Symmetry: D2
């Protein structure tokens, strides 16, 4: 009697035990969902990481920049879940921006090839995954992507923020297409989460000024949040993704749910 | 094993079997919640209506314009739920705007006394109820109010839209106060629902032009909604309110969840 | 050859030489506009203040809560400007919230009578003035109101923020009515301005905590603003109001122009 | 005594006499501005078109996808305006999306190479131009870009809408950089304009369904606009761009001004 009992859900984006997708996968399994996982490039690493999940789940390779991986994806998922079975859910928890597009590298100094790669992975791939998976999704189904509120510019995030603005726009169009299948498409805008990369950035991996700026942003976020914000805890974000994967928000689509402690609703 | 098992929830706003609050109360009970209901003025009528709910629930009188009703409310709820017990949820499903403030009566012709009454009932009362109930709410608790997207002006709704804009602002402040109790505060922005009053308006109860305009708005809403919009079905709205009353959106506060078929995310 | 040469403009809201309306009136006159001023209650004081403006301007009494003042307003303006002449512009620079609705007084402790008075003056009066003045405005005309961005809740501002949210909604409806006259209606959302009342608040006139909170908000505003924000200088705000009164934004209506140093477009 | 007397302004984006940039250039010249024009690929055509402007203006080649054109741009402008002189204004009126990214071609069928080209030209180039031109702009200067409101998804526009969402995000970051030079950066969100390409689209150049959908969008736009919307008249848009190029909106940056007849503020 979990929130997601009997649901078949694809979860992309696990790389480490601190990935937001690891926690989404863990909570979905705690809630009775049967998962299919997708991983990029380091499959041996991802398998060892996913071995820590409450239940076993088939892992499929998916490089979103690879058209062959996308073209074979639905067939590979069908084989993993069994012929005649379809997905009820899809989680996009994929994001990347080359170092030139984030941090202390001046915003104007990011070459377009780098920005384009980041936009391909972080925004266009949300449409790529929906195109590949909608033909194998059941009516009442749900597609969820991870967002970081890009409504206002912020230091260091730079082109990653531009990619999120593009992602929010993509989500509204994916919802139009997904609707033809009786499927919802939404994003969860999370507050900052101390993933391995976020800790490294605050530690100065992308320059001192950028680290200092992200640390101030994190502190301000918890201060603004009426219920507080714990950057070390991805569970509230994972629960929110599961809320969207469930039958409990059936009239919400092309939309954004903020799992940010309410920080975006307050100025100070 | 319902979504709201063991939760004690107050639900205001039932007047007819077509009230959005009736459906919120029905779904909350189907999901294991123990309810306390509040009713305005016509208690005998409300009791006969609520007798149709899946389970028995104490009904308390609450006129939000009456300071004595508000001052005695927490004590009356405690008596109904038993000393030592507190509420986990509160539903505000209250709205009113005198006839001069809605319909064919020109927007400029609404006297302030009428607008002020409508704003008192539809917006200020969200803060009034939170003030009365927060001292008897448990941490992890949830306050939910009903909204109708007032981001853009629309024909006929007139001062009711102004009252909703004020309500959205009130919600952000209530979240600040509710946070001190470990309580969330959010609104559900519903698409148009064919309540008794909505059917009467489309039928011309507030003038021909206003009826024609609201009918066009309803049609456009379903056309824009990527998953469609059924104005005759309050169930998707009721489910969304229950999603907010549950433990599944724990990092969302001072916010608005749109249960509108995704219509507000599309232009055409 | 001023920006507003030959335009007849009504300007309300002058009380001191630090009123935003004093600077709007000064810049409009520097730009060739012929003004009619309205004042509340302290006409002798207002006249002595307005004697400092670059040019002489008739001053009319206007209490926005007084229906007789509103009913006689168009006739009184016509007498001041001459029969056969109409206004090209109207400036609403009126705002009030009783002490219980702002500052350290808890948000929940503001009685409705106080909130309603504040909403009457700060929001409903924008519609009251447009109703009175549209019959004496020329096509191509412009109505401008003063806003303080209420999209996110903030400390101390409390019910004044709720009143601004209501004002933004009122503006969108006033635009619908004003359009029938070929008239535009818009708000200027200013950054914080050190008026006499703002200085008194920071100084602790409405409690220590509220003063400290508003001082932090002011500092954050200049820090966020990509071009900086000088709270001691109302000139950039006055220039923006004149931009809206001019023929230079002819396709903008029911809208909000932010004269806030760009602070609302940045998170940090 | 024009609005832009003595200002040196670069205007990009003229291709035909129906280009929005042609009208921006015409109004800026009527208002006393001294222009430098940039053109893409068809310089002989652009020169013959620009010969119709009120005054002579040097024309420089600028392909925004060409790093050499961008690297030599400031030097070429300085040569055209004279050593010791700098620009007061910059107009970005550049947009492109390959046919696969707009129209009847399904949203999912646009290959990334096409989307990336469109995003390069329509969004990234706003940052490219600011990087090249800020070192030759005077304090008090203004950068203006052309936007088409992408807040909600719409039929046919597809990836062009995604590119506009990315552009709005880019604008907020450009404002941060431009602020260091005492320069403002803003976008004008225009209503639909019957350029040669728009007429061809409505005529079915990108498929019947797309043409029909854009025609419905145009009709709805004028219906919603409280002051109406004339798609055959770029003058109100050109005037708005000049308002931003002037000294009259000195505290507005990282922002969006809507020259859309107020259509985006109304639902119906
Ligand atoms: N960490 C935060 O503060 C934060 C905040 C809000 C939203 N988000 C978003 O959450 C999502 C997950 O990120 P995270 O913070 O868990 O970091 P992460 O590094 O753990 O997850 C990013 C994932 O993207 C994958 N990926 C990269 N390139 C790929 C490709 N070519 N094909 C397929 N997958 C590819 C990586 O392998 C990794 O699994 C991202 O969309 C991120 O932007 C993160
Ligand atoms: N019907 C729609 O299309 C629609 C759309 C979105 C949101 N909403 C909102 O949903 C909520 C419920 O409205 P509904 O559509 O179910 O209509 P309804 O008439 O069934 O419910 C309104 C309720 O407000 C109560 N109320 C009025 N004055 C009161 C007072 N002084 N004290 C206490 N309660 C008082 C009424 O008794 C009634 O129970 C309202 O906030 C409404 O604005 C309605
Ligand atoms: N000061 C700021 O930081 C700030 C920021 C943004 C917007 N604004 C807005 O600018 C406008 C002008 O305020 P200000 O800051 O110049 O303060 P102010 O005190 O100088 O101006 C407020 C004016 O409202 C008038 N008023 C009050 N009650 C009235 C009534 N019954 N009838 C008619 N007029 C009445 C007062 O007489 C006064 O002239 C207000 O709308 C205010 O909210 C102020
Ligand atoms: N037409 C509308 O309905 C509408 C509405 C709102 C905003 N806009 C925007 O206004 C701007 C001007 O477009 P328009 O409608 O006048 O169409 P247009 O075709 O007349 O202008 C587009 C311009 O972009 C130029 N361009 C394309 N690729 C380029 C490159 N590689 N380098 C440099 N310049 C390049 C073209 O040469 C052309 O001059 C665009 O940003 C467009 O999206 C248009
Ligand atoms: C909002 C947000 C913040 C961070 C640090 N990573 C992410 S996605 C993960 C990631 C890592 C990198 C990188 N440059 O290593 N780029 O993207 N998204
Ligand atoms: C958004 C929306 C629409 C309607 C018809 N009623 C409501 S609340 C119910 C109601 C009824 C009335 C009335 N004038 O009878 N005023 O308010 N809210
Ligand atoms: C946004 C903003 C801020 C302030 C201090 N005053 C205003 S209007 C002026 C005013 C003064 C008072 C008062 N309580 O004296 N209420 O309103 N508006
Ligand atoms: C919002 C909007 C609408 C249109 C028709 N063109 C533009 S920019 C001009 C353009 C033309 C094309 C094309 N595919 O020919 N792509 O972009 N922008
Ligand atoms: Mg294991
Ligand atoms: Mg019964
Ligand atoms: Mg004098
Ligand atoms: Mg010529």
């Amino acid at each position: 009697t979990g929130l997601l009992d009997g649901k078949r859900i694809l979860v992309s984006g696990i790389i480490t035990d601190s990935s937001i997708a690891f926690h989404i996968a863990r909570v979905a399994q705690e809630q009775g969902a049967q998962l299919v996982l997708t991983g990029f490039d380091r499959l041996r690493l991802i398998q060892r990481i996913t071995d820590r999940l409450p239940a076993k789940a088939p892992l499929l390779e998916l490089d979103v920049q690879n058209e062959e991986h996308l073209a074979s994806l639905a067939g590979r998922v069908t084989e993993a879940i069994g012929a005649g079975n379809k997905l009820d859910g899809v989680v996009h928890s994929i994001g990347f921006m080359p170092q030139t597009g984030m941090g202390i590298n001046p915003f104007f100094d990011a070459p377009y090839a780098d920005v384009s790669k980041g936009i391909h992975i972080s925004a266009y791939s949300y449409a790529s995954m929906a195109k590949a998976l909608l033909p194998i999704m059941n009516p009442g189904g749900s597609i969820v992507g991870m967002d970081f509120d890009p409504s206002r510019a912020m230091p260091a995030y730079n082109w990653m923020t531009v990619a999120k603005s593009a992602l929010e726009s993509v989500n509204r169009f994916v919802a139009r297409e997904a609707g033809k299948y009786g499927v919802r498409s939404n994003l969860v805008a999370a507050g900052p989460i101390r993933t391995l990369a976020m800790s490294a950035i605050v530690g100065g991996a992308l320059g001192e000024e950028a680290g200092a700026q992200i640390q101030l942003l994190e502190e301000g976020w918890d201060q603004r949040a009426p219920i507080g914000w714990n950057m070390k805890d991805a569970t509230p974000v994972a629960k929110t993704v599961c809320a969207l994967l469930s039958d409990w928000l059936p009239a919400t689509t092309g939309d954004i749910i903020y799992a940010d402690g309410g920080a975006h609703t307050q100025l100070l």
